[PDB]
Amino acid sequence: KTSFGSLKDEDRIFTNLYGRHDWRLKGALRRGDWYKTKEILLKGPDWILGEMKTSGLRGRGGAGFPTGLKWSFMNKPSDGRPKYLVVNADEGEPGTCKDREIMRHDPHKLVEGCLVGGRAMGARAAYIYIRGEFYNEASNLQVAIREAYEAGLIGKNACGSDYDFDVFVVRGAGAYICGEETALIESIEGKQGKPRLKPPFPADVGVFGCPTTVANVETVAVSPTICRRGGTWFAGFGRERNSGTKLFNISGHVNHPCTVEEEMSVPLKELIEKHAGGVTGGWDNLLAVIPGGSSTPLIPKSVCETVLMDFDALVQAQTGLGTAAVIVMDRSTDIVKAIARLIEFYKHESCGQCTPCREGVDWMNKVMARFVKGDARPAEIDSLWEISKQIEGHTICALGDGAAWPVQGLIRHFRPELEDRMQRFAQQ
Amino acid sequence: DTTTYKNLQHHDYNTYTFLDLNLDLSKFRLPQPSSGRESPR
Amino acid sequence: SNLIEVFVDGQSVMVEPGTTVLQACEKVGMQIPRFCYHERLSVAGNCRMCLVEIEKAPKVVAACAMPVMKGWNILTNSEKSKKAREGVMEFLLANHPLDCPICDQGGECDLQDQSMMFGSDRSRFLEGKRAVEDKNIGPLVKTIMTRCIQCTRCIRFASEIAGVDDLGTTGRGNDMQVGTYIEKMFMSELSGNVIDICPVGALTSKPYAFTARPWETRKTESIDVMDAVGSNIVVSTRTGEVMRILPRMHEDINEEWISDKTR
Amino acid sequence: ALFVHRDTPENNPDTPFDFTPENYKRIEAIVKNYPEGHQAAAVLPVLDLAQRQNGWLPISAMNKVAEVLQVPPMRVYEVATFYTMYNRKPVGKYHIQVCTTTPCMLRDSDSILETLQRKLGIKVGETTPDKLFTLIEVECLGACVNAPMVQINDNYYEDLTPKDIEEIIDELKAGKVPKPGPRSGRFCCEPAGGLTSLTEPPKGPGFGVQAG
Amino acid sequence: SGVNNTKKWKMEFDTRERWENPLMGWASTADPLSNMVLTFSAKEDAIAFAEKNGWSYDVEEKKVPKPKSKSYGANFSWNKRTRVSTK
Ligand SMILES: Cc1cc2nc3c(=O)[nH]c(=O)nc-3n(C[C@H](O)[C@H](O)[C@H](O)COP(=O)(O)O)c2cc1C
Ligand code: SF4
Ligand code: SF4
Ligand code: SF4
Ligand code: FES
Ligand code: FES
């Protein structure tokens, strides 16, 4: 119960995350899927949610909220409408590649986990929204679904079970905002990817005005083997409040950038050193790291040596975990340029319906460009902090938060570099 | 084995693969719901 | 019964379920500021100006859209909500163009009066504004879209009341442009009502263009004689002339709307 | 770029476009992909299909989609302006993309952009005079690990370098649309420095199974 | 959309002949009650003031907007016609 980050391959819940054995059915069936799914389904729905609540499985997307509670919001019967299950694969946040690398190389985990989630909840079918740029991955997935339909695992008798299910694959069109719970839903409905206000919640009224619970790829893909192996076993790894395995995408300024499944609450330094061998120039050459993709603030190397890769730890460090897409800077790169690029991205990917992210994100983009060039003065730094705090909790969706948090992470840990660039531009 | 890459079929996909497969899948899929209505107009 | 006890700055008020915070506060007398909600159109929380804290909840809520829950105190003049309004006005007036003396909704602008009550008095904006291409709808509605605040109070009217569905939003970000993607005469028998709907002067009337100003105008409550509907009307004069027509509010007839003839 | 339309001789409501008899089969399949009501959900796949049958989206296509779906055309215009994967102006045979977000700006993406500019003689957003290649700077694409990457007509070329995109382009010009993926020692997201995550066999069925 | 210019009963007079001044075109009058407006917190106060000062009055009753049932969830219905095609 102390200093545990390393593990073995019996626990690797993504046994083919590198496409080394097989992605089709014949080859996936060997890796422990579609095994006892009839027994799982007919065991009961509440048994599945009990396994979830005992596993302590938090949402492995951006906003980590405990599942079981989330999936139990539509255990109630239907008052004259069908129910649906939207699997989210608009993996648009920077640094995040894990959902791609499972979409290809292990689609059947996803399919059976989605079925299991539906029968745990109630669902006529499912809608696997996938990014528009993921054409070949989506086609691998469609082939897997076709093999499943042919083998008799889905449809009029889903592995028997006295329960009928379908699995659809909706295809996006290239917008990061369509990863949100509600923009995704409206895009499936056939409109712009503009989020809704929440309330209403998708479990009372969602896609097509019907109940839904949106879920990420791995959030469901780990469901069936959790049911198959218990919440005790999944909760045994990781701290008591945020447990389980975790895919970890690593990018930038490290010798061997990679995707890894690892034990949650592993230290960031253990993670970087074991897999994706040491950063360029070694640890001393480290400058800052972003643990999430881009909707999480910076880390200054002062709390990289004494921090666990968890929700609670990074929250204690005035930061947060999202999809856990580690990104590294190594003293050889302008950092304000990087964060200005992130804000340029968050400007391009805004929907625009709510005023703060419509305007203030463009404010911050322009101001951070001006800080890159050094054409500002330090009385604007706290002004821009105030602009961030205006944008934070004044929005419909959490893209304003994601735009405002890297800003705060830079102002909190790298203000003197802004000061230096300003005085340099002023002198010259 | 674990010696090479075996997601090899995607190196020869056309433009109309996803849609051809959704077409072939429409046969298997069940009847759908109905809002007692053809459109919101 | 099916009632709910709700508090507004402490003061209790009894409202049905399905209501909201704006209506609860209206039952007291407070109207919360707003740029998107109309009371005759579908709700769309797109201005984020109707933000009020609840006494112990950690964040603010859209008072136009959030339904009110049992056992709530709505704090309207609290520093959190005032900070929210000041920030929202900052963002709105950031790219807004300095066209107040040009603009025909000059002494009639909700943006002005809301900046004057519920907003700061200074710009900390030191960057270049935008400027949007204008649209030639028709001989009535004069679109100057460098000043639209993207409130969507017009698309909802055109879709839900006029039943047209020829008005939308193109793009995203600051570059989202309200209107058609094409040249199309938005030419309906309920089209001049957008001039009253749009709180901003992004679209005004062409006949009234540049003629008078609201403080100059005397206002006599008359009725219509074109049709036999009896649409209540306000005739606005200026030194013995007639300058424009406007609707009155009667819910049995002329539900804030009038035809394009009689205006 | 514009988000407004003005009727060119080329692009106009009478610019010719109607689906082929097979694309209509695909369309009715797509409409069976959603309930009987809410047939408007197929706007994205049907517009993408039109784009896939003509390369770009003329106004004629955006209105024929509405006619097929009996949706108003304005909603289709909204949808086509919002999402960026739709080409509202004509492009070349090979629509090239380059990520410049930080996880790929931070692994020499500007180098690839420069080499892709000079090798083609164009600026960033321009198209070639032969109407064969184009180029644009876009955001993330979900392969941030294999950082220096591109997308060339719904296929990925990743973990690449200047020589390994010059080779690519000269392979595209002679028709040999080459194999996608990492143009390096890798073949996937794995660490280039040998296996470090798993190298033993994956376990069979019935493994670690709870009672039931 | 503001309603504070309401809430107070006013008392106006009938309008009378205005005419173009033959020099400049200004608007002239022959009545002094033209620019006349009073304000009363209630209605009986106004009837009292008018009956007291000897004016025949016409009272227009108080027009209050109907309360209405708003719902942001009706915009995303499965069966109803409130399913708006936009957002
Ligand atoms: C702008 C924005 C983009 C998001 N994009 C994604 C995404 O691409 N993939 C994802 O899984 N979640 C994304 N989210 C978080 C989703 O709300 C979350 O994934 C979903 O609620 C499922 O949560 P879960 O992890 O419990 O399954 C995004 C949120 C915001 C505000
Ligand atoms: S924060 Fe940005 S993306 Fe989210 S609803 Fe508001 S404008 Fe749209
Ligand atoms: S709408 Fe007209 S009057 Fe109001 S702030 Fe804008 S320019 Fe000024
Ligand atoms: S034109 Fe007027 S009513 Fe329409 S969105 Fe813009 S500000 Fe709102
Ligand atoms: S009045 Fe509520 S967000 Fe506009
Ligand atoms: S940041 Fe470049 S592919 Fe994701």
Numbering used by the authors:
A (entry chain F): 9 to 436
B (entry chain s): 28 to 68
C (entry chain G): 6 to 268
D (entry chain E): 5 to 216
E (entry chain Q): 47 to 133
What are the paper's exact sentences on this?
Mitochondrial complex I (NADH:ubiquinone oxidoreductase)1 is central to oxidative phosphorylation in mammalian cells. It captures the free energy released from reduction of ubiquinone by NADH to pump protons across the inner mitochondrial membrane, support the proton-motive force and power ATP synthesis. Mammalian complex I comprises 45 subunits: fourteen “core” subunits, which are conserved from bacteria to humans and sufficient for catalysis, and 31 “supernumerary” subunits, which are required for assembly, stability, regulation, or fulfil independent metabolic roles. The hydrophobic Q10 enters the enzyme from the mitochondrial inner membrane through a long binding channel, elevating its redox active headgroup out of the membrane plane to within electron-transfer distance of N2.
Here, we have used the canonical complex I inhibitor piericidin A1 (referred to hereon as piericidin for simplicity) to determine the structure of complex I with a ubiquinone-analogue inhibitor bound in its active site. Density for a bound piericidin was readily identified at the top of the ubiquinone-binding cavity, where the ubiquinone ring and first three isoprenoids of ubiquinone-10 are expected to bind. Its ring carbonyl accepts a hydrogen bond from the Tyr108 hydroxyl (O–O distance 3.4 Å), consistent with the keto form of the piericidin headgroup (rather than the tautomeric enol form with an aromatic ring, a deprotonated pyridone-N and a hydroxyl). Because piericidin lacks a second carbonyl it cannot form a second ubiquinone-like hydrogen bond to His59. Instead, His59 Nδ1 forms a hydrogen bond (N–O distance 3.2 Å) with the piericidin 2′ methoxy. The piericidin isoprenoid-like tail tracks along the proposed ubiquinone-binding channel, overlapping the predicted positions of isoprenoids one to three and surrounded by a series of hydrophobic sidechains, including NDUFS7 Phe86 in a π–π interaction and NDUFS2-Phe167 and Phe168 framing the final isoprenoid-like unit.
